[PDB]
């Protein structure tokens, strides 16, 4: 009443319509059916039998109690089946006989206590099984169920407290398997259960005894081992002894978010020497001591959401090899100090966002000796003052993010001087005066400039301006800049622009003239003051690839007839035509231009 046609003859959204059967009007060609929140107490061989082409079927929370014999008989092409949140009493042996090539099965919160609820003997190529939020107490798969193709096995939020050798043997044929045991408190692991085990991901989130984990995982090889906990768990402190078993396994990446380390000292991490990445998010760190051992070949470190007072309190000498450091969302003001990171010779990425950082001189002292640095994030901080050449210490920089950080720059100063490799610069809501004309000197390679929410004198972009020197610029964002006008020669020297966002300003059609030299662009003119678009502008629009004119006070009178005809013939080229409406005459106010046909002289 009625299903939403998302793609003609292919994809239908029937959610929340209180339906008791597939609508007669759904075509036989349907491939993607979104049927969640309907009412199907029993499903059976007649239910879906005409929908022979389904590849995706979502029956989330459809009040299904019964799946009778041959229910999916016609779904030979089924790739994904979602049966989440149905109060299932029984599933017939031959229910899944049809979808022999099924890849992904979601059986979350179906009230089951065992995988043998689900007769899976017809699924020889399954890739994903999601069994979260049930009564399950064992990871063991049904004997003879093929696992060669299994990549994701997910048991989040179950009643699994023990992993046996026999449990694990049921998984041996899979390769690069990810096993999600998040929300299962592991009380024991059978010694030898993890002999020669290989996993892509292994998640034991929220588990209450880490000693059991590190001992139990002896001999396994794991890419990402997720051992974080949560705010609603009342976890015991981590004692140094807990990490001993890590000596007898191979792990690339470990997450320990929200834990509390008791008695942090020089040897606590000795067993971490093989680790490539360590994430210590929100672990109540107010400092780390130096002389810490076991972390000197670590590449990636996360110390976000902690409570350092000073960047020097992280003791960077511990991590000579780092290529990535994140320390974002520090719960106090992070004082940056001087050369506090100078040790990090090979640092390539630094994230210091949301750190309440405050300084009236930046950033050569703070970033001292970080000359391999390629990406810097200083977004969402307090006001920063930048003198000319403020990033002298980081000449190889390719991305610089200062979004939502107010910037204080003096007249004719060039803070980005000598950043000859910078490709991406985000200055959203930095509140710079963009008429300061040395502003962007030293940026020959810049391709992407985001200037959303900055300031232009009198809301005009002048014929000569600070953007002119940016010869390789491809992407320019000038939305929310309170622009009234753009001089027709403002952009003439920017010949490689292909994405120009001028949305949420007060522009008229005269602004289009500034794009006459460009072809094939994306041009966003949404939420401006465009009304009439005269014939002499139409060749400029015809030149572009996509144009967004939604939420403009478009004129739907004969005075705008050439644009209105152009619009009907150029629907390919137009984005959001559904929100592109007439302002006048009053009769046509709020009517889509796509629904207007005038007769003029």
């Amino acid at each position: 009443q009625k299903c939403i046609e998302k793609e003609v003859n292919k994809t239908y959204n029937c959610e929340n319509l209180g339906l008791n059967e597939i609508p007669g009007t759904l075509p036989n060609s349907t491939e993607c059916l979104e049927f969640s929140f309907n009412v199907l107490p029993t499903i059976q061989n007649t239910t879906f039998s005409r929908l022979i082409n389904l590849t995706f079927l979502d029956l989330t929370r459809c009040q299904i109690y019964w799946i009778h014999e041959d229910t999916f008989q016609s779904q030979h092409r089924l790739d994904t089946l979602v049966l989440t949140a149905n109060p299932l009493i029984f599933m017939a042996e031959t229910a899944l006989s049809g979808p022999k090539a099924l890849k992904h099965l979601f059986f979350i919160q179906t009230g089951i206590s065992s995988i043998d609820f689900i007769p899976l003997h017809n699924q020889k190529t399954l890739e994903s099984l999601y069994l979260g939020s049930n009564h399950i107490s064992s990871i063991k798969l049904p004997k003879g169920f093929p696992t060669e193709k299994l990549k994701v096995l997910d048991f989040q939020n179950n009643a699994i407290h023990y992993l046996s050798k026999e449990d694990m043997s049921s998984l041996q044929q899979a390769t690069n398997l990810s096993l999600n045991l998040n929300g299962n408190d592991i009380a024991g692991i059978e010694p030898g259960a993890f002999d020669s085990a290989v996993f892509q991901s292994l998640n034991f989130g929220g588990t209450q005894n880490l000693l059991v984990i590190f001992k139990g995982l002896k001999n396994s090889t794991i890419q990402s081992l997720w051992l974080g906990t949560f705010e609603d768990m009342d976890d015991e402190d981590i004692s140094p002894a807990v990490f001993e078993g890590l000596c007898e396994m191979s792990v690339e990446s470990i997450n320990l978010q929200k834990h509390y380390f008791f008695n942090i000292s020089s040897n606590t991490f000795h067993c971490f020497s093989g680790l490539q990445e360590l994430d210590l998010t929100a672990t109540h760190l107010s400092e780390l001591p130096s002389g810490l051992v076991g972390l000197s070949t670590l590449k990636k470190l996360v110390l976000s959401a902690n409570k350092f007072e000073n960047l020097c309190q992280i003791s960077a000498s511990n991590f000579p090899s780092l290529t990535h450091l994140s320390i974002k969302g520090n719960t106090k003001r992070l004082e940056l100090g001087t050369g506090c990171l100078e040790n990090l010779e090979n640092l390539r990425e630094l994230d210091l966002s949301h750190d309440d950082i405050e300084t009236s001189d930046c950033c050569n002292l703070q970033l001292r000796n970080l000359s391999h640095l390629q990406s810097l994030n200083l977004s969402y901080n307090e006001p920063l003052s930048l003198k000319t050449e403020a990033f002298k210490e980081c000449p190889q920089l390719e991305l610089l993010d200062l979004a939502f950080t107010r910037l204080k720059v003096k007249d004719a100063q060039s803070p980005f001087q000598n950043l000859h490799l910078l490709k991406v610069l985000n200055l959203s809501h930095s509140l710079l005066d963009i008429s300061s004309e040395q502003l962007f000197d030293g940026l020959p390679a810049l391709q992407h400039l985001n200037l959303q929410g900055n300031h232009f004198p009198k809301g005009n972009i002048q014929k000569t301006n600070s953007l002119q020197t940016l010869g390789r610029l491809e992407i320019l964002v000038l939305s929310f800049c309170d622009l009234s006008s753009i001089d027709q020669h403002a952009f003439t020297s920017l010949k490689m622009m292909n994405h120009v966002d001028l949305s949420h300003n007060r522009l008229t059609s005269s602004s289009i003239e500034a794009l006459s030299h460009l072809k094939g662009i994306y041009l966003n003119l949404a939420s401006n003051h465009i009304s009439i678009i005269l014939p002499s502008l139409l060749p400029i629009l015809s030149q572009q690839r996509t144009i967004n004119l939604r939420q403009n006070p478009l004129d739907c009178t004969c005075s705008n007839i050439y644009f209105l005809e152009w619009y009907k013939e150029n629907m390919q080229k137009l984005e959001d035509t559904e929100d592109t409406l007439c302002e006048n005459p009053p009769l046509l106010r709020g009517v889509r231009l796509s629904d207007v046909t005038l007769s003029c002289s």
């Binding site: 059976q44 019964w66 009778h68 014999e69 109060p87 009493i89 029984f90 599933m91 017939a92 042996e93 009230g111 089951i112 206590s113 065992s114 043998d116 609820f117 007769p119």
Partner: protein, 139 residues
């Protein structure tokens, strides 16, 4: 009435049933069906309980060609001996059982048989009622 379900079809033996409780259906699948029924079969069974099952008994009434072969009664749950982990569950609970039943071995002569299986409590109130047809053929 309720749909006819197949519990079992292999090794020459086919078991088809219909719930004879007007109130509801139930699900049943039998593993390792054959004309030579092995002892202690595994089944899967799903139902909503209409009575508590602290005291639960099974009647079997077997016939062929319009006359009685066998009547038999057997307790599943009793106060002095709950045989199964599901004993003592209560009215309204959804039950799923996948496990053994400890029947004796038996060979089924080719032919067709009508089986009435009834689960009931100490007051003879219906917990489940199955009207089954069992067909044995050459294999």
């Amino acid at each position: 009435g309720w749909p006819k379900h197949t519990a079992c079809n292999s090794g020459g033996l086919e078991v088809v049933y219909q719930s004879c409780d007007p109130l509801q259906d139930f699900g049943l699948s039998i593993d390792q069906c054959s004309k030579q029924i092995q002892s202690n079969l595994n089944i899967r069974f799903g139902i909503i309980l209409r009575q508590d099952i602290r005291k639960l008994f099974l009647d079997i009434t077997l016939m062929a060609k319009g006359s009685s072969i066998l009547n038999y009664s057997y307790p599943l749950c009793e106060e002095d001996q709950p045989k199964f982990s599901f004993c003592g569950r209560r009215k309204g609970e959804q039950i799923y059982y996948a496990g053994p039943v400890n029947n004796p071995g038996l060979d089924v002569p080719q032919g067709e048989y009508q089986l009435l299986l009834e689960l009931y409590n100490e007051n003879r109130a219906t917990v489940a009622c199955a009207n089954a047809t069992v067909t044995s053929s050459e294999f």
